[PDB]
Amino acid sequence: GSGAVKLSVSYRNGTLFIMVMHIKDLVTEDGADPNPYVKTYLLPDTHKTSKRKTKISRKTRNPTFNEMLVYSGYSKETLRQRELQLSVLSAESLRENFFLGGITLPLKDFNLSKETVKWYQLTA
């Protein structure tokens, strides 16, 4: 299943709010507890300014973040032509950080006039 992430997606005062609440069931291909963090981009990214990331959650497959990722300066019209590429990676200090799972969500699928809160299944 690769795990699932709970997110709150809302938009107010011209700002997109992505709250990464928590993740459950991440899997590594080696039985070691990863050091997960979440990274998002809004694509396509004309100016190369959309990278956002949470802090690192140490040794766990079920991290709780409760972190708000903020994307300001976008109109709702522009967002309808953007996808939220969310990636969960393990932060590693003696080897390359590795991909645990992710999901791409077209913002057009969201009623950005309200707050959408739900769990999303990650893919690999």
UniProtKB/Swiss-Prot annotation:
Protein location: Cell membrane; Cytoplasmic vesicle, Clathrin-coated vesicle; Nucleus; Cytoplasm
- Ranges of residues in domain C2: 3-120
Highest taxon, organism lineage? Eukaryota
Q: What happens when the gene is disrupted?
A: Chronic renal failure and kidney lesions. Affects podocyte morphology and function.
Q: In what way is this protein post-translationally modified? A: Phosphorylated upon insulin stimulation; which may lead to enzyme activation.
List the disulfide bonds in this chain.
none
How is expression of this protein distributed across tissues? Expressed in brain (at protein level). Detected in podocytes.
- Motif Nuclear localization signal, per the record, lies over 48-59
Q: Which residues form the signal peptide?
A: none
User: Which function does this protein serve?
Assistant: Generates phosphatidylinositol 3-phosphate (PtdIns3P) and phosphatidylinositol 3,4-bisphosphate (PtdIns(3,4)P2) that act as second messengers. Has a role in several intracellular trafficking events. Functions in insulin signaling and secretion. Required for translocation of the glucose transporter SLC2A4/GLUT4 to the plasma membrane and glucose uptake in response to insulin-mediated RHOQ activation.
The record's comment on protein family reads: Belongs to the PI3/PI4-kinase family.
Q: How does it assemble?
A: Interacts with ERBB2 and EGFR. Interacts with clathrin trimers. Interacts with SBF2/MTMR13.
Q: What is this protein called?
A: Phosphatidylinositol 4-phosphate 3-kinase C2 domain-containing subunit alpha
